[PDB]
Amino acid sequence: TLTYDDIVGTGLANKCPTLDDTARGAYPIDSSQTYRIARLCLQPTTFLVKEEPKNKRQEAEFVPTKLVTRETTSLDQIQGELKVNSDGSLTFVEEDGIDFQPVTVQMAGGERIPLLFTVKNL
Amino acid sequence: GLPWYRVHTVLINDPGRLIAAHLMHTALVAGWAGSMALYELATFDPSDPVLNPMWR
């Protein structure tokens, strides 16, 4: 079990926890039971930005960008209600957490695209 | 003395200074290439190869 001193400055603190390959199981939902997500984490690996169409007005594509704001990008410690609906579908209702990060990515040619990467009120 | 349009003939019998002069010329031309490239890169919009290519 890793401590802060094991993690600090490695980059691991910006990584979400992973599960190994044997984890292909199933988690039963009791439709009489109330549920929560205790921690939702989102670690972005690629940011794509839609190029502004030349004027040809064809399909503008999403192009790769380079992250310049370093490993400051993940959303984590997010928690909320997991409702069980009458049709047996599940709905996550985000309540709180570190559910946003400012991010600047840089396009081919130098253009920097700041964004608020977020799942606020998901 | 030498007329102005003859100033460079001093190199005719000075192979070392002629080599030096050729080096300087070459330096100027390569410096030009570098600076031209830099200026063009400072002005070129690469955003539209279709209707705004370099030759436009």
Ligand code: CLA
């Ligand atoms: C490889 C190319 C080359 C070379 C090495 C030479 C070499 C030389 N020529 Mg020139 N010459 C050339 C091409 C060349 N010539 C061409 C193409 C022409 C036709 C226009 C002439 C016409 C010519 C004449 C009529 C004479 C020479 C003479 C001279 C000699 C003295 C140069 C001098 O003192 O100028 C000194 C020059 C200045 C102090 C200022 C010149 C300013 C110019 C006119 C304007 C600005 C030029 C700009 C900086 C250059 C840009 C580069 C260009 C290629 C785009 C020298 C041996 C003279 C000579 O034989 O002496 C006995 C001489 O009488 N040449």
Ligand code: CLA
């Ligand atoms: C390839 C270019 C070149 C080369 C290798 C030479 C080589 C040489 N020149 Mg020549 N010269 C040149 C171009 C060149 N010259 C030009 C274009 C002129 C006309 C201005 C002259 C005029 C000249 C004279 C009158 C004499 C020589 C002589 C000599 C020799 C001694 C150096 C000296 O006195 O510099 C003098 C030359 C300069 C200082 C060049 C002028 C500099 C110009 C204005 C450009 C400077 C760059 C600047 C930072 C950019 C401005 C940007 C602008 C947009 C504001 C030497 C062999 C001498 C010699 O030995 O005669 C017997 C001599 O007396 N040169």
Ligand code: CLA
């Ligand atoms: C080993 C055989 C050899 C070689 C490989 C060269 C090569 C060349 N000669 Mg030289 N030359 C030679 C024998 C040789 N020469 C002999 C026997 C004579 C009679 C004395 C001359 C007289 C001569 C004259 C009069 C002139 C040349 C020039 C040139 C150059 C024109 C191309 C250029 O500038 O590209 C651009 C340059 C590069 C892309 C960089 C090349 C990297 C260099 C070679 C490394 C420098 C370090 C090296 C250890 C020291 C110099 C090497 C020397 C053998 C050339 C070029 C470097 C001209 C020149 O020097 O003008 C500038 C010129 O004016 N040569």
Ligand code: CLA
């Ligand atoms: C293969 C292509 C080539 C060739 C053959 C030359 C040849 C030569 N260069 Mg050039 N040069 C070249 C490419 C070339 N260059 C490039 C790509 C650059 C980078 C832009 C330069 C930059 C350069 C500089 C900075 C200088 C030279 C000079 C010279 C000359 C040195 C010998 C001399 O004493 O002439 C004596 C001069 C002449 C015989 C007159 C040449 C007249 C030319 C061909 C047209 C002049 C146009 C007009 C009258 C004046 C310019 C307009 C003005 C509004 C600026 C020589 C004629 C040097 C020189 O001219 O010293 C005087 C010099 O200063 N060259």
Ligand SMILES: CCCCCCCCCCCCCCCC(=O)OC[C@H](CO[C@@H]1O[C@H](CS(=O)(=O)O)[C@@H](O)[C@H](O)[C@H]1O)OC(=O)CCCCCCCCCCCCCCC
């Ligand atoms: C708008 C303007 C602003 C631009 C200013 C930028 C440059 C400022 C410097 C200009 C002043 C030069 C003073 C002269 C020095 C001198 O002693 O001359 C004599 C020297 C040798 O030293 C000498 O040699 C002499 C004999 S001999 O020449 O060796 O035969 C002898 O008298 C003496 O003892 C000895 O010291 O040799 C020369 O003849 C060179 C003089 C020519 C210099 C002008 C060229 C400037 C353009 C260069 C641009 C580079 C382009 C980029 C390419 C890579």
Ligand SMILES: CCCCCCCCCCCCCCCC(=O)OC[C@H](COP(=O)(O)OC[C@@H](O)CO)OC(=O)CCCCCCCCCCCCCCC
């Ligand atoms: C990019 C870097 C730029 C820096 C380079 C700077 C460029 C320098 C350019 C030098 C050119 C100077 C011109 C020399 C002018 C000058 O000195 O000539 C007089 C000169 C006489 O020289 P001599 O052989 O008699 O020797 C005297 C010596 O002292 C010369 O130094 O003859 C030549 O130079 C040939 C060119 C004749 C040119 C004659 C044309 C002029 C007649 C009138 C034209 C206008 C009126 C027309 C009416 C329709």
Ligand SMILES: CC1=C(/C=C/C(C)=C/C=C\C(C)=C\C=C\C=C(C)\C=C\C=C(C)\C=C\C2=C(C)CCCC2(C)C)C(C)(C)CCC1
């Ligand atoms: C030294 C040292 C350093 C530095 C260098 C530099 C700083 C750079 C450069 C170069 C340069 C940056 C300079 C130059 C060039 C320019 C030129 C040479 C141009 C030309 C002009 C002319 C010649 C043309 C004329 C024209 C007119 C003007 C108009 C129209 C007509 C005509 C076209 C004629 C280094 C680090 C490298 C290292 C080594 C050593």
